Symmetry: C3
Subunit: 145 residues, 3 copies
């Protein structure tokens, strides 16, 4: 109805404001319709997935050049690598999102995937490029909502 | 209308995201439709009520086993007891919510209510159990929204 | 429809809750429909405008006695002066909001506008009164959303 249009405006305004506050505080990064955020912790892959899901989100994963630079900037800011939301399929060499879908956008550091042993997980360098690796290292936890 | 369904979806998405960010940062705890939060201050009862109301909320009070454990976890995290949103009625022994209603859910430490003198307020131990007491101690301020 | 009224209620509730959390944490100040917030940085005027706009807001500017005291309180809290969202028009003596409109509400410290040289910007004293000045000083960044 009439009052309906009104209320919707106020709500939109408020959400924008709170999103502005968290942005200014640097506690979140908005890219398109994805929101990236970190609590500053550096734990292993399994642990990170828990944190994100516990918070209502998911371990972060870039699907576009812009989302990738957004996550890299957080990594750069904390001077630590980031574990991305993806693991290697059954047939080595290929990676898939946790939902099971196979990865589309990639940004491997020249030569990767390449490595010592299994290397089923993916870490992001502070420059944004990816490197496959083990899942037991301590990496900055970054989630997407 | 049509565009209406759309806008409602975006709004819901955004709220969820911001709520996810505050959860990940550990600045809030969501339980059912209640949100618990603390600013880390340790002040007396009167002071706590002011803080909560000033922030648009109310001094926290558990009404279910789950809300109780949620508040205890915050108490445990800060290693301090929490003053709950309740005071003793006119007739000693009984407690009521600040709205005037008489308490339903309780989780007294074995023996409580029991104590030295008046003990009109209620503090929560780090294990979740309650103990009645004075209202002038310095306790962690926790609010519910 | 029916379910519509329901969803609107939940949304309003959630927004209120998150706004309560940011208020309790002291990360934002709500005055009427304006939200003021600071990241604690002390940079020059140009830099401040960037921060605010980058966060989806604008450099703060009081338009009522209440908004003015709200900003002063933040200034008082950080013990630093605040650059306001306004610059001097083409004809010295008069100031305008960044949108181009000429200022309405003012709260100059007795004697101001008055000063050394150009003084095209406006800083707020910790008591709330304004003083015109250069735009290259390091002042607390405060944004409005
Ligand atoms: Sm490798
Ligand atoms: Sm492999
Ligand atoms: Sm007792
Ligand atoms: Sm008694
Ligand atoms: Sm001056
Ligand atoms: Sm001048």
């Amino acid at each position: 109805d009439e009052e309906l249009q009104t209320e919707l405006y106020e709500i939109k305004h408020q959400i924008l404001q709170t999103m502005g506050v968290l942005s200014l505080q640097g506690s979140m990064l908005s890219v398109g319709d994805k929101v990236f955020s970190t609590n500053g912790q550096s734990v292993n892959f399994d642990t990170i997935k828990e944190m994100c899901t516990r918070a209502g989100g998911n371990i972060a994963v870039p699907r576009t050049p812009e989302e990738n630079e957004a996550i890299a900037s957080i990594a750069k800011k904390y001077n630590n690598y980031v574990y991305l939301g993806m693991i290697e399929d059954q047939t080595p060499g290929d990676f898939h999102y946790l939902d099971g879908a196979s990865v589309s956008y990639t940004n491997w550091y020249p030569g990767e995937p390449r490595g010592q042993g299994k290397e089923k997980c993916v870490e992001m360098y502070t420059d944004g490029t990816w490197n496959d690796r083990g899942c037991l290292q301590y990496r900055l936890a970054v989630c997407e909502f």
